Amino acid sequence: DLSNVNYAEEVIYHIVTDRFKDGDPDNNPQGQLFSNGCSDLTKYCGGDWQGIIDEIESGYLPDMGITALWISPPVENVFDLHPEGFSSYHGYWARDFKKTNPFFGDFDDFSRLIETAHAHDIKVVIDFVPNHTSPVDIEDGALYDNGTLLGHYSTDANNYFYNYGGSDFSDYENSIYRNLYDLASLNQQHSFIDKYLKESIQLWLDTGIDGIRVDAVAHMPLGWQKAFISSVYDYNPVFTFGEWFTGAQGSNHYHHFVNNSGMSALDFRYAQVAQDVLRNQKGTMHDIYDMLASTQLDYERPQDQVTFIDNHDIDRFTVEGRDTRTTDIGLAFLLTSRGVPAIYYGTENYMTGKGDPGNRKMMESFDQTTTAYQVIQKLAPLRQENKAVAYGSTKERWINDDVLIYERSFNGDYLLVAINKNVNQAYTISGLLTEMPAQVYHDVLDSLLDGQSLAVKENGTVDSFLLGPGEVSVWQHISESGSAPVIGQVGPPMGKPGDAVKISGSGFGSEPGTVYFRDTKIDVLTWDDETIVITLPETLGGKAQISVTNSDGVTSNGYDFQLLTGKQESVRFVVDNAHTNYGENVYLVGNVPELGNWNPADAIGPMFNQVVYSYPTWYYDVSVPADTALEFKFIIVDGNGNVTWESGGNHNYRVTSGSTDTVRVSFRR
Ligand SMILES: [Ca+2]
Ligand SMILES: [Ca+2]
Ligand SMILES: [Ca+2]
Ligand SMILES: [Ca+2]
Ligand SMILES: [Ca+2]
Ligand SMILES: [Ca+2]
Ligand SMILES: [Cl-]
Ligand SMILES: [Cl-]
Ligand SMILES: [Cl-]
Ligand SMILES: [Cl-]
Ligand SMILES: [Cl-]
Ligand SMILES: [Cl-]
Ligand SMILES: [Cl-]
Ligand SMILES: [Cl-]
Ligand SMILES: [Cl-]
Ligand SMILES: [Cl-]
Ligand SMILES: [Cl-]
Ligand SMILES: [Cl-]
Ligand SMILES: [Cl-]
Ligand code: NA
Numbered sequence: 001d002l003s004n005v006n007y008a009e010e011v012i013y014h015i016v017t018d019r020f021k022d023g024d025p026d027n028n029p030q031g032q033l034f035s036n037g038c039s040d041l042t043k044y045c046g047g048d049w050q051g052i053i054d055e056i057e058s059g060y061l062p063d064m065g066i067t068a069l070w071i072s073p074p075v076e077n078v079f080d081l082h083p084e085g086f087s088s089y090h091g092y093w094a095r096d097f098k099k100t101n102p103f104f105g106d107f108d109d110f111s112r113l114i115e116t117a118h119a120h121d122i123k124v125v126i127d128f129v130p131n132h133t134s135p136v137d138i139e140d141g142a143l144y145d146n147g148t149l150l151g152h153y154s155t156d157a158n159n160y161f162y163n164y165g166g167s168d169f170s171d172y173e174n175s176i177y178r179n180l181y182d183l184a185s186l187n188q189q190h191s192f193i194d195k196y197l198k199e200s201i202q203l204w205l206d207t208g209i210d211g212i213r214v215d216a217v218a219h220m221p222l223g224w225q226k227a228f229i230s231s232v233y234d235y236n237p238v239f240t241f242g243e244w245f246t247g248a249q250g251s252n253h254y255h256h257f258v259n260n261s262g263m264s265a266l267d268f269r270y271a272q273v274a275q276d277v278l279r280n281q282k283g284t285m286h287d288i289y290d291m292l293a294s295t296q297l298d299y300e301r302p303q304d305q306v307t308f309i310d311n312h313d314i315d316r317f318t319v320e321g322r323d324t325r326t327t328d329i330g331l332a333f334l335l336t337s338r339g340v341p342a343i344y345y346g347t348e349n350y351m352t353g354k355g356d357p358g359n360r361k362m363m364e365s366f367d368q369t370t371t372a373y374q375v376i377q378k379l380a381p382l383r384q385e386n387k388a389v390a391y392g393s394t395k396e397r398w399i400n401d402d403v404l405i406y407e408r409s410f411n412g413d414y415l416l417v418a419i420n421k422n423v424n425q426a427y428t429i430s431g432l433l434t435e436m437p438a439q440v441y442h443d444v445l446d447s448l449l450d451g452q453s454l455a456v457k458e459n460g461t462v463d464s465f466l467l468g469p470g471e472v473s474v475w476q477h478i479s480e481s482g483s484a485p486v487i488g489q490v491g492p493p494m495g496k497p498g499d500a501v502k503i504s505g506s507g508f509g510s511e512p513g514t515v516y517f518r519d520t521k522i523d524v525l526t527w528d529d530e531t532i533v534i535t536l537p538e539t540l541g542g543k544a545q546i547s548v549t550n551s552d553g554v555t556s557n558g559y560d561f562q563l564l565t566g567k568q569e570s571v572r573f574v575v576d577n578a579h580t581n582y583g584e585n586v587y588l589v590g591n592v593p594e595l596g597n598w599n600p601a602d603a604i605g606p607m608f609n610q611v612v613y614s615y616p617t618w619y620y621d622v623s624v625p626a627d628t629a630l631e632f633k634f635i636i637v638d639g640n641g642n643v644t645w646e647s648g649g650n651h652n653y654r655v656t657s658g659s660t661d662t663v664r665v666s667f668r669r
Contacts, residue, residue: 001500002237002491002500002501002502002533003210004123004210004211004237004238004239005237005238005239005491005492005501005502006239006489006491006502006504007068007123007211007239007304007306007340008303008304008340008383008390008391008488008489008504009067009383009384009390010067010068010123010340010383011065011066011067011068011335011340011341011343011376011380011383012066012067012068012069012070012125012306012340012341012342012343013061013064013066013068013069013070013342013343013345014070014308014311014312014342014343014344014345015052015069015070015071015072015345016047016072016090016312016345016360017047017048017049017052017071017072017074017091017104018044018045018046018047018048018072018089018090018091018103018104019038019045019047019089019345019360019361019362019363020047020051020052020055020345020363021047021048021051021052021054021055021363022045022046022047022048022051023048023049023050023051023052023053023054024048024050024051024105024109025046027048027050027102027103027104027105028044028046028103029044029103032081033079033081033087034046038361038362040085041357041358041360041361042085042086042087042089042357043085043087043089044087044089044103045089045362046103047104047362047363048103048104048105048109049074049104049105049109049110049112049113050105050109050112052069052071052113053112053113053116055366056116056117056120056122057116058366060366060368061120061122062120062121062122063368063377064348064368064373064376064377064380065376065377065378065379065380065381066122066343066376066380067121067122067123067380067384068122068123068124068125068210068211069117069122069123069124069125070125070126070127070211070213070342071124071125071126071127072090072091072092072104072126072127073091073092073094073101073126073127073128073129073215074091074100074101074104074110074126074204075091075094075096075097075098075099075100075101075129075200076094076095076096076097076099076100076101076102076144077091077092077093077094077095077101077134078093078095078133078134078135078138078139078142079095080138080139081138082135082137082138083137083138086135088101088134090312090360091104091127091129092127092129092215093133093134093135093138093183094129094132094133094134094143095133095134095139095142095143095144096143096144096145096146096147097145097196097197097200097203098144098145098146098147098199098200098203099144099146099147107207110207111207111208114207114208114209115208118208123210123211124208124209124210124211125209125210125211125212125213125239126204126209126211126212126213127213127215128201128204128212128213128214128215129214129215129216130186130188130197130201130214130215130220130228131180131183131185131186131188131215131216131219131220132179132180132183132184132185132186132216133153133183133184133186134183134184135181135182135183135184136153136154136179136182136183136184137182139152140152140153140154140155140184141153141154141161141183141184143160143184143186145196150196153184158190158192159187159190160186160187160190160192160193161184161185161186161187162177162178162179162185162186162187163185164177164178164179164611164612165178166178166179167179172253173608173609173610173611174610174611175218175219176219176220176221177611177612178611180216180219188220188221188224188228188570188660189221189224189570189572189621189660189662190660191659191660191661194224194228194570194659194660195659197228198228198231201228201232202235202236205232205235205236205238206236209238210238210239211238211239211240211241212232212238212239212240212241213240213241213242213243213266213306214229214240214241214242214243214263215242215243216243217242217243217244217257217261217263217265218244218245218253218254218257221570221620221621222256222257222260222261223570223571223604223620223621223622223623224570224621224623225242225261225262225263226260226261226262226494226568226570226623227568227569227570227623227660228570229261229262229263229494230262230494230495230496230564230567230568230623231567231568233262233492233494233495233499234496234499234567237491237492239264239491240263240264241263241264241265241266241304241305241306242257242261242263242264242265242266243265243266243313244257244258244265244266244268245268245313246268246269246272247268247269247272248269248272248273248276248291249269249294250268250269250298254268255298255299258298258299258300258305259299259300259301260562262492262493262494262562263493264301264304264305264306264493265305265306266305266306266308266311266342267295267305267306267307267308267339269291269294269295270291270295270305270307270308270337270339271307271308271309271310271311271314272314273287273288273291274288274309274330274333274334275309275310275314275315275317277421278309278317278326278329278330278333278421279309279315279317279319279326279330284400284401284402285399285400285401285402285403285404285419285421286399286401288404289396289399289404289406292337292338292394292396292406293394293396296338296393296394300560301489301493301560302338302339303338303339303340303390303391303488303489304339304340304489304493305339305340306339306340306341306342307334307337307338307339307340307341307342308334308341308342308343308344309330309331309333309334309344309347310344310347310359311342311344312344312356312359312360313356313359314359315353315354315355315359316344316346316347316351316352316353316354316358316359317330317344317347318347318350318351318352319352320352323423323470324350324371324372325371325423325449325470326421326423326470327347327350327372328371328372328375328448328449328472329419329421329449329470329472331343331347331348331372331375331376331379332375332379332417332419332445332449332472332474333417333419333472335375335376335379335380335382335383336379336382336389336408336415336417336474337394338392338393338394338408341383343376345363346361346363346364347372348370348372348373348376349363349364349365349366349367349370349372349373350370350372351363351364371448371449374448375445375448375449378444378445378446378448378474379444379445379474382415382444382474382476385478386413386415386476386478387410387411387413387488387505387506388408388409388410388413388414388415388476389408389413389415389476390410390488390489391410391486391488391489391504391505392408392409392410392413392414392415393408393409393410394406394407394408395407395408395409397416397432397433397434398418398429398431398432400427402420402421402422402425402427403418403419403420403421403422403427403429403467404418404419405417405418405419405429405432407434407435407436409435410486410488410506411479411482411484411486411505411506411507412477412479412482412483413476413477413478413479413482413506414434414435414436414437414476414477415474415475415476416434416436416441416454416474416475416476417472417473417474417475418451418467418471418472418473419471419472420467420468420469420470420471420472421470422469422470423469423470424469425469426466426467426468426469426471427466427467428464428465428466428467429462429464429465429466429467430464431461432461432462433460433461433462434456434460434462435460436456436475436477437456437477438456438457438458439455439456439477440453440454440455440456441453441454441455441456441475441476441477442475443473443474443475444474444475444476445472445473445474449470449471449472449473450468450469450470450471450472451471451472451473451474452465452471452473454473454475481506481507481529481530482506482507483507483554484507484550484554484556485505485506485507485508485509485513485548485549485550485554485555485556486505486506486507486556486557487503487504487505487546487547487548487556487557487559488504488505488506489503489504489505490502490503490504490546490559490561491504493560493561493562494561494562494563494564495536495562495563495564496536496563496564496565496566496567496568496625497536497537497538497539497563497564497566498535498536498538499535499536500525500533500534500535500536501533501534501535501536501561502531502532502533503515503531503532503533503534503546503548503559504530504531505530505548505556506529506530507529507550507556508527508528508529508530508531508532508548508550509527509529509550509551509552510527510528510529510551511527511551512524512527512551513527513548513549513550513551513552513553514548514549515532515534515546515547515548515549516546516547516548516549517536517537517539517544517545517546517561517563518539518540518544518545520537520539521537522534522535522536522537522546523535523537532548536563537563539563540593540597541562541563541564541565541592541593541594542562542563542593542597542602543560543561543562543563543593544560544561544563545558545559545560545561546558546559546561547559563593564593564594564625565592565593565594565625565628566625566626566627566628567625567626567627567657568594568623568624568625568626569623569624569625569626569655569657569659569660569661570621570622570623570660570661571621571622571623571624571655571660571661571662571663572612572619572620572621572622572660572661572662572663573588573604573607573619573620573621573622573632573662573663573664574613574617574618574619574662574663574664574665575588575607575617575618575619575634575664575665575666575667576616576617576664576665576666576667577616577617577666577667577669578616578617578618578634578636578667579616579667579669580616580636581638583638583639584636584637584638584639585605585606585607585636585637586605586606586607586609586618586634586635586636586637586667587600587603587604587605587606587607587634587635587636587637588603588604588605588607588620588622588632588633588634588635589602589603589604589632589633589634589635590630590631590632590633590650591629591630591631591632591650592624592625592628592630594622594623594624594625595622595624595630595632600635600637600643603635603637604620604622605620605637606637607619607620608620616667618634624655625655626655626656626657626658627654627655627656627657628654628655629652629654630652630653630654630655631650631651631652632650632651632653633645633646633650633651634646634667646667646668646669647668647669648668651663651665
């Protein structure tokens with residue numbers, strides 16, 4: 001029930017369904033859609049759900065130590081080729097969100113996949129693509145609803161799609177409302193389509209999926225996404241994260257998504273720096289730690305982000321013609337770092353390939369004897385047994401250009417990892433300090449990567465040792481049920497009053513103490529040392545801290561939580577006749593915390609004014625509580641943050657729920 005809201009202890013294995021294993025040749029496409037031997041990487045090669053099942057049953061997947069399978073969209077895709085030859089093998093060209101892609105299997109096959117994975121305590125995460133259907137030149141973006149045609153893109157009579165110009169090299173607004181490439185953009189703000197997408201995700205939730213990866217989150221309004229994910233949490237909460245492509249430093253909009261959307265993201269900052277330094281020999285370990293420190297600060301919930309060192313949209317981590325020890329090192333780093341690690345299928349067998357679709361070759365073999373496979377076997381389990389790995393912060397204990405020694409800790413549990421990325425040089429490590437208790441520690445990798453023991457003294461010091469070329473050593477300390485409560489994760493990370501939420505950590509004690517949101521006491525459903533289930537309080541919402549006090553009276557760290565006012569709907573706010581001077585933007589502010597609780601510092605915006613409406617009309621799609629008295633005003637804010645308020649009284653509105661809405665006013669000057 002809340003069994004899927006916390007992935008901190010999971011290790012994800014990411015499969016491109018068509019490219020993993022053809023378990024059922026009979027469901028293979030025939031003719032131009034199919035590539036025999038997978039010689040044309042733009043076509044279907046035959047990988048299917050039976051193939052994944054086969055590799056669970058054989059032990060290949062569960063024996064690796066992975067605990068979750070993240071797979072391609074399971075929904076029916078277009079059956080014709082793009083005019084340039086491209087096929088829908090990847091699942092991102094939907095035609096019916098209520099049906100299976102019959103090339104992957106039927107609903108019975110899907111159920112068998114779910115049942116088989118669950119039988120081995122493996123979770124199943126699916127891609128979900130609410131942004132678009134298919135390339136417009138194939139079938140005019142055809143959308144079906146369990147076999148019933150809803151409509152097409154170019155001939156759209158019901159505003160089911162967005163049909164705006166462009167776009168090339170877009171700004172944020174254009175990135176959202178104009179088409180992604182040549183893909184038919186769904187109009188999520190249209191009540192019928194919003195309802196359809198909700199019915200669709202609910203169907204898949206009903207099949208037993210355990211998590212969702214939302215595609216193209218950089219191309220949909222954050223307000224719509226917040227309302228949508230809130231409805232997912234209402235219905236059947238599962239861990240949800242989005243793919244927002246970005247670079248080492250991320251971006252303003254990316255960070256807002258990570259911290260404010262209600263879901264987490266793929267950690268592209270982590271991935272891009274790992275590729276820079278480890279894969280491509282750009283920069284040094286100093287760049288890796290800069291990234292760790294920076295992201296620890298910038299992300300409200302580092303433990304919720306999904307980390308990776310490669311994926312379906314960047315170069316394979318394994319470089320052709322190079323010592324594969326580097327991939328082993330990359331995996332060790334990934335598995336012991338903060339955030340939920342996602343291993344890309346075939347990394348463990350050193351598959352190579354640059355770009356798309358070069359990075360999506362057919363799974364080569366199923367070799368359990370690679371060093372990489374063994375590395376995963378040794379380290380994946382740590383996340384379930386050691387709370388420092390699942391929830392801990394990160395500290396640098398030793399560093400030079402080639403070496404990083406980092407420590408994670410959580411309520412008395414510890415991890416210490418030493419990595420030397422230079423395969424040609426060894427380094428003498430002197431002056432190392434650690435907070436781990438005094439004792440001799442043995443390498444968790446069992447010297448798989450040339451690791452060694454560590455003797456820690458009472459004062460935290462360690463005798464000099466030689467860190468060999470390409471060496472990784474992993475050391476850990478696990479303590480009993482900690483003293484002092486510490487919260488490691490809260491899931492879902494957002495909710496409305498009455499919603500059940502799970503607080504995970506340790507040191508809570510065996511008997512109910514107290515839980516608070518801000519200064520409001522919360523109802524406890526269940527309580528043990530590592531897990532407390534609560535129901536969210538009816539009190540002023542917004543982003544505030546949840547804190548736990550044990551029965552001994554000791555209070556925990558505060559943990560950021562987003563309390564909603566009620567059931568959310570995506571509402572487009574439109575304001576006419578809002579003239580601004582250069583450098584100024586219009587923002588929306590209002591009574592409920594969804595609208596900033598009257599605080600300009602927390603206002604919604606800057607609003608848009610190019611695509612759906614034109615200046616001096618501005619607009620924005622905002623998640624607001626339904627069946628709630630809303631009062632709001634628009635403000636004009638300059639580059640220094642100076643605020644000028646709309647004159648007169650508040651605009652009042654009440655969203656008579658069950659659907660998206662639009663509310664429109666004229667700016668009072
Ligand atoms: Ca097949
Ligand atoms: Ca079977
Ligand atoms: Ca058609
Ligand atoms: Ca869009
Ligand atoms: Ca309609
Ligand atoms: Ca030296
Ligand atoms: Cl549960
Ligand atoms: Cl062929
Ligand atoms: Cl993108
Ligand atoms: Cl450099
Ligand atoms: Cl060298
Ligand atoms: Cl310290
Ligand atoms: Cl919710
Ligand atoms: Cl106790
Ligand atoms: Cl207990
Ligand atoms: Cl500006
Ligand atoms: Cl004020
Ligand atoms: Cl009310
Ligand atoms: Cl109107
Ligand atoms: Na919003």
